[PDB]
């Protein structure tokens, strides 16, 4: 039921303003997301999959955005950079499942469209799970030519996050 959409959505918002989606009182599948070979990183930090069927989780979150290729190594706990410092920072005692898959034919046009944005300049670096949609010029585009490096190519990374009552 709940997240057949967020892994197959047609337009992910950028990392400077990501779009968290909470899901409540639905059935929790938690099996179509794993045992799929299309995912590059399947790092899960607190609790493990194949033991993720204790439906006590209420308001399961799902943050989704798009980062360039070798900046998905900033969505671990700790891991200071310019993505876990100014745009989107995970807490240190994080119990979730950061999932990242490649985007060959979806986000990289032959012209290399500049629709995506990531924030570069910000005083007072973020607390865990802090959005800042402000613009006063701190943002910059990427450029996504399809003959870039494998490390400079967009990875539509989505983070699941759990809590209890």
């Amino acid at each position, epitope marked *: 039921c709940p997240f057949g959409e967020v892994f197959n959505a047609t337009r992910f918002a950028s990392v400077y303003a990501w779009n968290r989606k909470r899901i409540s009182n639905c059935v929790a599948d938690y099996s179509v997301l794993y045992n799929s070979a299309s995912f590059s990183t399947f790092k*899960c930090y607190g609790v493990s999959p194949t033991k993720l069927n204790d439906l006590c989780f209420t308001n399961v979150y799902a943050d989704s955005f798009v980062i360039r290729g070798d900046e998905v*190594r900033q969505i671990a706990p700790g891991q200071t950079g310019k993505i876990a410092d100014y745009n989107y920072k995970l807490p240190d*005692d994080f119990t979730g499942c950061v999932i990242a898959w490649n985007s060959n034919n979806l986000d990289s046009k032959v012209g290399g469209n500049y629709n995506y944005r990531y924030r570069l300049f910000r005083k007072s670096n973020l607390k865990p799970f802090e959005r800042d949609i402000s613009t006063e010029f701190p943002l910059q585009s990427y450029g996504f030519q399809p003959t870039n490096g494998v490390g400079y190519q967009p990875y539509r990374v989505v983070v699941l996050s759990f809590e209890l009552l």
Partner: antibody
Amino acid sequence: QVQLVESGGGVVQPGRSLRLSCAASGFTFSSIAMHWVRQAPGKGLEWVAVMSFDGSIKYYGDSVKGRFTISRDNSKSTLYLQMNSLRAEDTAVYYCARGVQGYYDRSGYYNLDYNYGMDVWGQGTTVTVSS
Amino acid sequence: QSVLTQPPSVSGAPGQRVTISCTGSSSNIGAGYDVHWYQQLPGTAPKLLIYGNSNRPSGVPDRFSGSKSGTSASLAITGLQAEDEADYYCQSYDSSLSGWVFGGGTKLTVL
């Protein structure tokens, strides 16, 4: 406030033993893995020993395979490297290095993270061994 | 001695762009694990400078950049100051020996 404190190094008769320590304060010690690395004076760095998140998974380097043993103490948040039968090459300065908090897993099997470096480094201890 | 073979001593005039190359094997870099980069000032303990082949922690400037394509990685200092005379070590992770391997360390100094 994050810093690693080290103590345990000095002069050692070759064959009788020594046990190194590495304190840690300013973060969570019982969540992050820890690495031990060393440097003979003048030459390049080398990898020695790792201990996992809890103490279940251990790996070792080729030249300390057997004469070196790592063990951590999460009660007082302290890492210990136990060494015996020192040699003429092991005269070196020893760093304990904070690993990564990654304890990632897909399809159940908890395993250490093998793509991250060693973030914060202490001043370390030196050992001197000679007959 | 080491596993990764990087040049032992490279240097350049100030205000230029010096690249410290670091090539490796088909079992560690060509496997897919990411080359990190360290900075060892003379007499100190090394600190992390670049991880994940291109990222940079807060504290290092935007001068030190990285790259990785195939079985070769390289740091790239741009517009070097006099306060960069340190030693630089490329670290990867080997899959054959199951251990983190280092580089020989390249002596960089200003001219």
